[PDB]
Design a protein around this ligand. Structure first.
Ligand SMILES: *[C@@H]1O[C@H](CO)[C@@H](O)[C@H](O)[C@H]1NC(C)=O
Ligand SMILES: *[C@@H]1O[C@H](CO)[C@@H](O)[C@H](O)[C@H]1NC(C)=O
Ligand SMILES: *[C@@H]1O[C@H](CO)[C@@H](O)[C@H](O)[C@H]1NC(C)=O
Ligand SMILES: [Ca+2]
Ligand SMILES: [Ca+2]
Ligand code: NA
Ligand code: NA
Ligand code: NA
Ligand code: NA
Length: 245
């Protein structure tokens, strides 16, 4: 029903020295100013910034996680961080307020040995939230290739539908999900060249430009709160507008 037709010019919010990382805002209807950051491909700490002025000021508080993260594909939904427990096929839900956590295993997902979903960012699992669901993008350990998406029930942190896109990870740079549609970039992370209607179970044509920069892309995520794409590009924290049709 609602497909992206183009991506606007990016805004640079901050530049830092860490080539790879993520920056994340709350996605739910909450009026939350906080920004969460991780750096590098593994660790057990998150930097919490009160708001965007604090981000620009370098003023944060460390959050110690219950399990090490891997990668740059985490997401925040309803005051919980959803992330990949490094070296396992386990995803973690960590509630920021109560500091409790729950775990979910995806048994037929690649998760080690550099058999990545997105090689460009060493991503095994890309967690995402949009208007239509809470999602995990991953790659099949049955065939070593196919991009799969799990639809979760947020109330039980469990999978309710497994979607096989049939698209080979070798052709994917990165991806995001918006209004129920998976969008996958080319291997250079410059254009979106594949899309899939997740709940309808079918591929849909998509071919549109994403960005002109060639800097390495660590993270790419749609936030339904503001309908922007958030990215981390060679240490540059960027936001892009998106145009729907
Ligand atoms: C922003 O950074 C400057 C540089 O040290 C500092 O003086 C100022 O207090 C910071 N703003 C805060 C902490 O709100
Ligand atoms: C969010 O979390 C709160 C507290 O854990 C809970 O009451 C609520 O049902 C959750 N979901 C939404 C959509 O707020
Ligand atoms: C997904 O589809 C591919 C291509 O048809 C197939 O090889 C694979 O077994 C399917 N399921 C999984 C979990 O990969
Ligand atoms: Ca491989
Ligand atoms: Ca190859
Ligand atoms: Na930082
Ligand atoms: Na381009
Ligand atoms: Na690139
Ligand atoms: Na992504």
């Amino acid at each position: 029903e609602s497909m992206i037709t183009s991506i606007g010019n990016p805004v640079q919010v901050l530049k830092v020295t860490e080539t790879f990382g993520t920056w994340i805002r709350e996605s739910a209807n909450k009026s939350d100013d906080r920004i969460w950051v991780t750096e590098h491909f593994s660790g057990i700490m998150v930097k919490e910034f009160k708001d965007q002025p604090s981000l620009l000021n370098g003023s944060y508080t460390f959050i110690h996680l219950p399990y090490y993260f891997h990668g740059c594909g985490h997401v925040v939904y309803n005051n919980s961080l959803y992330y990949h427990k490094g070296g396992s096929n386990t995803l973690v839900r960590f509630e920021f307020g109560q500091e409790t956590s729950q775990t979910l295993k995806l048994e037929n997902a690649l998760y080690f040995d550099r058999k990545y979903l997105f090689a460009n960012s060493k991503t095994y699992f890309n967690l995402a939230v949009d208007e239509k669901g809470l999602w995990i993008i991953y790659a099949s350990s049955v065939d070593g290739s196919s991009i799969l998406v799990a639809q979760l029930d947020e109330r039980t942190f469990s999978v309710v539908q497994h979607v096989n896109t049939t698209y080979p990870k070798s052709k994917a740079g990165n991806a995001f999900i918006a209004r129920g549609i998976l969008y996958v970039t080319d291997t250079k992370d410059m254009r979106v060249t594949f899309a899939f209607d997740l709940l309808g179970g079918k591929q849909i044509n998509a071919n549109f430009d994403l960005r002109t920069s060639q800097s390495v892309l660590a993270m790419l995520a749609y936030n339904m709160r503001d309908q922007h794409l958030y990215s981390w590009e060679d240490g540059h924290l960027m936001l892009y507008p998106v145009q729907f049709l």
